[PDB]
Design an enzyme around this catalytic site. Structure first.
Site, short mmCIF file in Angstrom:
data_model
loop_
_atom_site.label_atom_id
_atom_site.label_comp_id
_atom_site.label_asym_id
_atom_site.label_seq_id
_atom_site.Cartn_x
_atom_site.Cartn_y
_atom_site.Cartn_z
N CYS A 38 4.14 1.55 9.34
CA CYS A 38 3.96 0.06 8.58
C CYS A 38 5.96 -0.26 7.46
O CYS A 38 6.77 0.61 7.04
CB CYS A 38 2.89 -0.14 6.68
SG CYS A 38 1.32 -0.04 7.93
N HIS A 48 0.87 -1.27 0.12
CA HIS A 48 0.14 0.08 0.24
C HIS A 48 0.76 0.86 0.49
O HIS A 48 0.56 1.87 0.60
CB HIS A 48 -1.23 -0.02 1.05
CG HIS A 48 -0.31 0.38 2.20
ND1 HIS A 48 -0.40 -0.63 3.60
CD2 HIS A 48 0.42 1.55 3.18
CE1 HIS A 48 0.68 0.44 4.20
NE2 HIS A 48 0.38 1.27 4.30
N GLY A 79 2.70 5.37 9.56
CA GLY A 79 4.41 5.54 9.06
C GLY A 79 5.02 4.39 9.40
O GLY A 79 6.38 4.54 8.34
C1 LIG Z 1 1.19 1.67 7.86
O1 LIG Z 1 2.15 2.72 8.55
C2 LIG Z 1 -0.43 2.15 8.87
C3 LIG Z 1 -0.18 2.13 10.06
C4 LIG Z 1 -1.46 2.36 11.33
C5 LIG Z 1 -1.56 3.73 11.05
C6 LIG Z 1 -2.34 4.15 12.63
N1 LIG Z 1 -1.29 3.00 13.10
C7 LIG Z 1 -1.17 1.50 12.48
O2 LIG Z 1 -0.45 0.57 12.73
N2 LIG Z 1 -1.57 1.72 8.39
C8 LIG Z 1 -2.66 1.95 7.76
O3 LIG Z 1 -2.79 2.70 7.80
C9 LIG Z 1 -3.89 1.68 6.95
C10 LIG Z 1 -3.59 1.20 5.27
C11 LIG Z 1 -4.34 0.50 4.41
C12 LIG Z 1 -3.29 0.37 3.72
C13 LIG Z 1 -4.79 -1.45 5.03
N3 LIG Z 1 -5.16 1.40 7.61
C14 LIG Z 1 -5.45 1.10 8.90
O4 LIG Z 1 -5.07 0.57 9.58
O5 LIG Z 1 -6.45 2.85 8.71
C15 LIG Z 1 -6.85 2.46 10.40
C16 LIG Z 1 -6.34 3.00 11.08
C17 LIG Z 1 -5.52 4.23 10.06
C18 LIG Z 1 -5.34 5.79 10.29
C19 LIG Z 1 -5.10 5.65 11.71
C20 LIG Z 1 -6.08 5.29 12.16
C21 LIG Z 1 -6.35 4.03 11.70
#
Ligand SMILES: *[C@H](O)[C@H](C[C@@H]1CCNC1=O)NC(=O)[C@H](CC(C)C)NC(=O)OCc1ccccc1
Ligand SMILES: *[C@H](O)[C@H](C[C@@H]1CCNC1=O)NC(=O)[C@H](CC(C)C)NC(=O)OCc1ccccc1
Lengths: 304, 304
Positions: free
Chosen positions: A145, A41, A143
């Site tokens: 991930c 992603h 960030g």
């Molecule tokens: C990648 O770094 C990120 C990790 C999340 C963001 C905040 N804490 C984490 O563990 N992943 C994402 O943003 C992910 C992207 C999609 C392609 C799955 N979406 C996600 O986890 O959505 C829920 C969310 C996003 C932002 C803040 C709080 C929850």
């Protein structure tokens, strides 16, 4: 003396972490040999992330769209491929710091060390367990991930986790290094939830053995039980059922302590039925279940 | 998302760890520049350790009695000196892996990362706090002495602890890198005990702010209090008294959350007076006090 949640030393993994940027999205990648691994992603924009068609999004990305940086040094991307939910970016330089390594998919109940990273820079390290519902309880921000989970058996790093997402309950989901998620989760921002977070019974018993080793014995009672009788009570409490293999795995801990596994089961049963009465075990007011039997023996025997 | 007890990445420190053997005793040393630091009781035999006269024991040790090994490679000792409770072994080779470093003595309440080691090899890493009674709750076995505690501010490692001993209560005692113990303890096997292990109030409040940041708010009540009224109740519970400087230090956390420090104090007071009623905060059934305000901001903002 003492017992702590403890992570493997992170040095061998620090040297494998790089920053990967595509468009406006930045996250971490794992640089082993001449390949960088990162969540796919990275190619999504803020909009794309709700129902991505990764194959279609990937058509419009070329090698020069993936900016890979190791320290202050830019790596040249010479190829790219999607394997399930991760990208493999071929670079023109093999990581001189590549350790002896393996890719393994762990089972629920097993533990591993997470090296949390941001912008390709290590932030901190902590120990996690793959929980029965295939989530982990880590510490991740935007960030993060591409941060990875790993074990070390002497000289060899066994990578088992790459972070991808957080769930509504605040717990975390990710893939093995072949890009296959643990659990039923998918890398899209749709409605999806965790499942019942049951307790790793065998791990709690290991931890109870750790307490006894460290002189905390107040919870040992005069009773024993049977595996069948114990499980009838344990599963009222959402504990994973205990099996004879689990009993076998706690064998060495049982012999080091002179406490039969089923005697310890009897002690756990009364702790579930009656609580801790405000006392603590190894400094915890909860039954801790993120220590494996191997974890306890390791820390109580000085393995390096 | 999520909140975990998290240690600094250990890579910069791994490269400084060596094995030090004198006679039959083996422990760890810290190799920075052309000097190895290690606890002085490496020179004691099993017998000596009950009432050592270190100056006298040191007369009969020469440079060639200190066997220093880095990996499978032997270092040549060309001088030696005792500074308080540590030895400084001058070697003929500067550690090529020496990071930018400093020696600091921390105050009670501050936290640091321990790299537990055995035979000069890193075993695992975990986070500790210097407790009000100048002990730490780590995980140490025989041969772990010389393991060090450290913080990292970007590129610079600040060494603050070297392990020496365990106390009857199972908690741990040690020195700064100049060999001065934290607390009244001495490196001999005589009757000596810890002192009242009081709670780091400011750290608990920081941790309560961390919970709110991560959406765990069930414990916020409709009340406020005063610093004087709060301390009257807190010290019935062996909490360190809270001061205006502590209030100041929690300022940024108070503003990020919109919760006045004294409002949060009111919430802590009712948690002390009424308990958790079997609920948890950030996965704990105890009030956790080994996170500083700086620690919380760090982990909730992605500092690397
Ligand atoms: C990648 O770094 C990120 C990790 C999340 C963001 C905040 N804490 C984490 O563990 N992943 C994402 O943003 C992910 C992207 C999609 C392609 C799955 N979406 C996600 O986890 O959505 C829920 C969310 C996003 C932002 C803040 C709080 C929850
Ligand atoms: C140094 O590696 C060692 C660390 C102790 C041993 C077990 N867990 C620890 O943290 N220190 C000593 O053995 C120390 C030596 C004197 C010069 C102070 N003595 C000590 O801590 O005695 C108590 C004790 C020794 C052995 C087992 C259990 C308690």
């Amino acid at each position: 003396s003492g017992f702590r949640k403890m992570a493997f030393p992170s040095g061998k993994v620090e040297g494998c972490m790089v920053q990967v940027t595509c468009g406006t999205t930045t996250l971490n990648g794992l640089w082993l040999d001449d390949v960088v691994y990162c969540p796919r992603h990275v190619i999504c924009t803020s909009e794309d992330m709700f129902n991505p068609n990764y194959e279609d999004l990937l058509i419009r990305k070329s090698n020069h769209n993936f900016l890979v940086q190791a320290g202050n040094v830019q790596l040249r991307v010479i190829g790219h491929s999607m394997q399930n939910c991760v990208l493999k970016l071929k670079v023109d330089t093999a990581n001189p710091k590549t350790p002896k390594y393996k890719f393994v998919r762990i089972q629920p109940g097993q533990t591993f060390s997470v090296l949390a990273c941001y912008n390709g820079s290590p932030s901190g390290v902590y120990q996690c367990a793959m929980r029965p519902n295939f989530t982990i309880k880590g510490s991740f921000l935007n960030g993060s991930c591409g941060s990875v989970g790993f074990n070390i058996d002497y000289d060899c790093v066994s990578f088992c986790y790459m972070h991808h997402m957080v769930l509504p309950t605040g717990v975390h989901a990710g893939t093995d290094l072949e890009g296959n998620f643990y659990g039923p989760f998918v890398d899209r921002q749709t409605a999806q939830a965790a499942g019942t977070d049951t307790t790793i019974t065998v791990n709690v018993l290991a931890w109870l053995y750790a307490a006894v080793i460290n002189g905390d014995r107040w919870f040992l009672n005069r009773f024993t039980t049977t595996l069948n009788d114990f499980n009838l009570v344990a599963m009222k409490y959402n504990y994973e059922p205990l099996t004879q293999d689990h009993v076998d795995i706690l064998g060495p801990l049982s012999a080091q302590t002179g406490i039969a596994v089923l005697d310890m089961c009897a002690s756990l049963k009364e702790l579930l039925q009656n609580g801790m009465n405000g006392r603590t075990i190894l400094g915890s007011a909860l039954l801790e279940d993120e220590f494996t039997p191997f974890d306890v023996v390791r820390q109580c025997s000085g393995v390096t």
